[PDB]
Every structure is written in structure tokens, then in C-alpha cells.
Write a protein that binds this DNA or RNA. Structure first.
Length: 246
RNA sequence: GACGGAGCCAGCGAGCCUUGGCCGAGAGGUCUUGGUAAAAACUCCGUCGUGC
RNA sequence: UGGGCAUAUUCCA
């Protein structure tokens, strides 16, 4: 087949070249026939994968930020045994600006691999979080909810942290992967990870990626592009653009 | 002596290198990626107690 | 009439 022959020599290409030996993420690059249309949401959006896990909250570090009072919410998730392990560190921004300003910032994505923040206080992350975090892997913080619905028409309503819900979408972001909308021709999605899958699991990851990505129901967040794709290339971090479809 | 919170006062001022796609003869643009580089003090509240 | 948070207002003097 077209794909799996190009994947075998890619996996052999991993274990022979030391520039490729140190980068374990696998991306795909999508040439679309025209440009996509919209840009600079700076928000990832998640695809529902239908077969197999990528990661789980046991295995990695999870980091949370909120608005004042953070002391009200930093106790609830650790006084429940379901969610006490599901995070590593929990603060607000107002500690975060004075804890790690500037030169310590290089050890941020060294010491972490997933960042999440409250939906209210997301719109100022790259200011205090720093420019150098962008955009080397294009890892970016995620947006979740702290409770159920709070409406805001004419009354000023308080909310309480519901831990089982945080557990519910927090388990939901680990099994899947996401993507970044932009206004260009090319589009990259990490879909593969070495020593954790087989080849046809990756084949179903790619065929599922075409399933959700070319959803013709014109749904918000579901099937954005139109007009059909040109080609799909595969590279890890420094390997060449090896095609599957042309 | 640590650790972690919460409290809170001022004055001098504006008064950097990479991987790859798409278009373009080209000049170049347009992006996706990896690494390296850049108030304090104090007040109180709770946990632990000496190694060159 | 003057300040605060949210970004047919609301609270305070």
C-alpha cells in the first residue's frame, strides 16, 4: 500500500539518524486546494478519535490557572480522591505573574506538557505566559469549564467547582488529539507517537482524520474546509514530507 | 530555617538560529514546526525540624 | 455629580 511502505522506512529512519532520535511526535501536513478562510482563534479544537488511546491523566502533568479566589477552588479538587491525582499545580494569574517572570520561563515547557485555564481568564495567556513558549511545537493551553452552566444576562452569579465534571472532560482530552485552525494552505496535526501504536492504528487515525476534517455538514468545529484536499505528507520533526495521497 | 497561602503602603516617567509544504520563471511572500537566548521588605495564618 | 467590577447596566458618596 501507499501509506505503510512509507511508514516502515520512516520508522527505520528514526533509529538511524540522531536528529530524528530525539523527537517522538508524528505529524501530518494537509495540502488543501485553497486557503481555509479564518485565522487567529489561538484556540485548539479536538477531534473525537474512535478506536484507541493516545494518553491518559495517569501518565503526564496537568496544570491549572483560574481567577480570584483561587484558594476557593484549589481545595475542592484535592479533597476528592477522583481528582487529587488528576493535576500537578493549581494557581491563578496573580500569583503566576510574580512567581516565574522572565528568565525562568524556559523551564516551563521543560517541566510541563499540558496546561489548562479557566474560560474567563484565557484571553491574556500569551502576555504573561511569554512569547518564547510559542510556537516551537505549537503546544498551547486548553480551555475547560469549572462547573455547569452560569448565565449572565442581568445578575452577577457565583459558581462552585464540580470535580466530576473536570474529571469528565479532563479524561476526554487525553484519549484524543486536536488541531489549530489557520488561514493558509498547509495544516499539521499530530496523529502518531512511536513505541505506542502499530501501523494500521495510524492508518485508522489518518482515515478518521479525513472523516472528521471533511465533515460536509458544515458544522462549527466539525468539517471546516471545503473543496477537497490535494495531498497528505508525513513528517515527525525533521524527516522529509513523505506523501501518502497525492 | 524551610514550605504554602492570605493581607498591604510609595516615589523619579507617557503628566536568535532550524524542518517542510503552497503560490510565484524569478525577486520574494505565505505558513507549519524544534532547540537555545531574556514593589521589595513587613503582618498574620497553617505543615517539617540541622548536610559538606 | 464622582469612583468599581462585567465589558433596557449594577453598587457605592
Amino acid at each position: 500500500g501507499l501509506a505503510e511502505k512509507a511508514l516502515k522506512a520512516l520508522i527505520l529512519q528514526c533509529e538511524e539518524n540522531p536528529s530524528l532520535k530525539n523527537d517522538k511526535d508524528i505529524h501530518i501536513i494537509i495540502n488543501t486546494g485553497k486557503k481555509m478562510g479564518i485565522n487567529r482563534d489561538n484556540i485548539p479544537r479536538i477531534i473525537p478519535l474512535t478506536k484507541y488511546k493516545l494518553f491518559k491523566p495517569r501518565d503526564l502533568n496537568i496544570l491549572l490557572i483560574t481567577k480570584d479566589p483561587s484558594a476557593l477552588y484549589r481545595e475542592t479538587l484535592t479533597k476528592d480522591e477522583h481528582t487529587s491525582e488528576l493535576f500537578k499545580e493549581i494557581i491563578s494569574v496573580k500569583n503566576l505573574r510574580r512567581r516565574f517572570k522572565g528568565s525562568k520561563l524556559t523551564q516551563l515547557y521543560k517541566d510541563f506538557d499540558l496546561v489548562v485555564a479557566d474560560y474567563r481568564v484565557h484571553h491574556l495567556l500569551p502576555e504573561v505566559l511569554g512569547s518564547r513558549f510559542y510556537h516551537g511545537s505549537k503546544k498551547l493551553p486548553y480551555m475547560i469549564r469549572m462547573s455547569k452552566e452560569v448565565k449572565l444576562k442581568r445578575q452577577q452569579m457565583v459558581e462552585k467547582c464540580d470535580p466530576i465534571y473536570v474529571r469528565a472532560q479532563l479524561r476526554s482530552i487525553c484519549k484524543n488529539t486536536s488541531y489549530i485552525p489557520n488561514n493558509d494552505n498547509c495544516l499539521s496535526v499530530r496523529v502518531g507517537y512511536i513505541q505506542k501504536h502499530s501501523i494500521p492504528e495510524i492508518l485508522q487515525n489518518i482515515q478518521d482524520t479525513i472523516n472528521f476534517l471533511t465533515d460536509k455538514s458544515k458544522r462549527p468545529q466539525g468539517g471546516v474546509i471545503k473543496g477537497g484536499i490535494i495531498s497528505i505528507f508525513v513528517k515527525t520533526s525533521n524527516s522529509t514530507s513523505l506523501p501518502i495521497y497525492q
